[PDB]
Design a protein around this ligand. Sequence first.
Ligand SMILES: [Cl-]
Lengths: 257, 259
Amino acid sequence: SIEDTPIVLIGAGNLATNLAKALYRKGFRIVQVYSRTEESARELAQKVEAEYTTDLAEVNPYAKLYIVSLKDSAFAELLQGIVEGKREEALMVHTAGSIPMNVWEGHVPHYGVFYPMQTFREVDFKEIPFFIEASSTEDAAFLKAIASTLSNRVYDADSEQRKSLHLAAVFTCNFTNHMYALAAELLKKYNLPFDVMLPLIDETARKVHELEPKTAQTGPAIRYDENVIGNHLRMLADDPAMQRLYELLSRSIHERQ
Amino acid sequence: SIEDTPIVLIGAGNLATNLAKALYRKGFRIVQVYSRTEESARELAQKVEAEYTTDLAEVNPYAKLYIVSLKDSAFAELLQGIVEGKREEALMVHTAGSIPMNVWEGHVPHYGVFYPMQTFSKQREVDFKEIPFFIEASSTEDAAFLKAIASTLSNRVYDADSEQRKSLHLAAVFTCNFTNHMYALAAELLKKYNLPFDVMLPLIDETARKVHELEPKTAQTGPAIRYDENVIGNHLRMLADDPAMQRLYELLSRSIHER
Ligand SMILES: [Cl-]
């Protein structure tokens, strides 16, 4: 029934490819693929038993869902040609999380954001989170049902919520890796190999699959053990920037008790 | 033979719970557990089929090894209550990264540090096989004894001084404690926007696995490298509700940028 949603793809890049193939494997009919270049459109279209076009005027107007994955400018330039000719029920979605849903506003009555947030080629979607925004509660439910066909992790998220993901990634990837870097600087200073940290790094990550971070939290800053922290701060005296960081991070941990 | 060593745990927290279970599974005899609170003493004793007490005066004086996992504030208070009436050959060890071995000196003839370095939680099982275990003792024969015990548990058993061990522990606070806090803040943020923390797990996994291949310095990604002042401005703007979290973001970004 849901796999009886005729689908058109506008764009034949990597994400589009993965998405189309996974949809096709799940039982979905992909009726047609569009791409800027002949090669790209044909190639993907051959992988999912679909027609292909290079011309927006030849895009099938009667599908239920249109998945646009074009880059910013290209998407931009071509929005009106994408919109042109589509019947009222056509659901118009784009896959880029950074592009507000309101681009479709005034052009089509049924639209949304269909954002699969991916970690890095071919990727199976069963653990990849999907973030859904739509022009209506029914359009959202439909896109969520489409996405749940491919993934166990499907959520409502507006632009503000989608920004919070990338803010959270900064903490989770950038700031975490920096902690590894500061550890490495210290072990370099003290002439101790860094490889000893690797089991601690792995387990720190592994642990929060099972426990909430707040519960997984350990160390001297929980009770604010000054016998430890005071001494650690002293060893960092020669790097007052790193020392401030140690202090502020420890207070931040302690403020959560 | 070495599994016949009767062991007492003085302290029943996260590290002690995990270390006790690993000893018990390897066939060691944990005779009893002491803790300041009945709930913690009992929970652990049931897991490792041991007696328990919350009174140091009731502590079994007949064991060969006493593993002490206590905060500083309980150490002094409780040191002589831990050490009196024991066998001359009993070994007293503590498990702290940043406490010198010399705490014991003058108090008991045999003593040492028995330090497994890993993040521990009671509700979470860990493979001891890959845990760095650092050993110091009052004599070579006591150190050989501790290492032999630790080697039944871990393939990574190392002799290290109090000075090396402090150094490792400082690096471990960054590596484990501050890293998990980054996860905690991300979770706080995601909750404020009605999103589950779990969406971060793939990225958490990638970030950790990356440093097996690359030096952390080489692995560093994100808008702080260039000091992308748009995204950084936008991000600071988002954290306006939380000045302390906002300042951390700024200094961490500043910090990446310098390096
Ligand atoms: Cl007592």
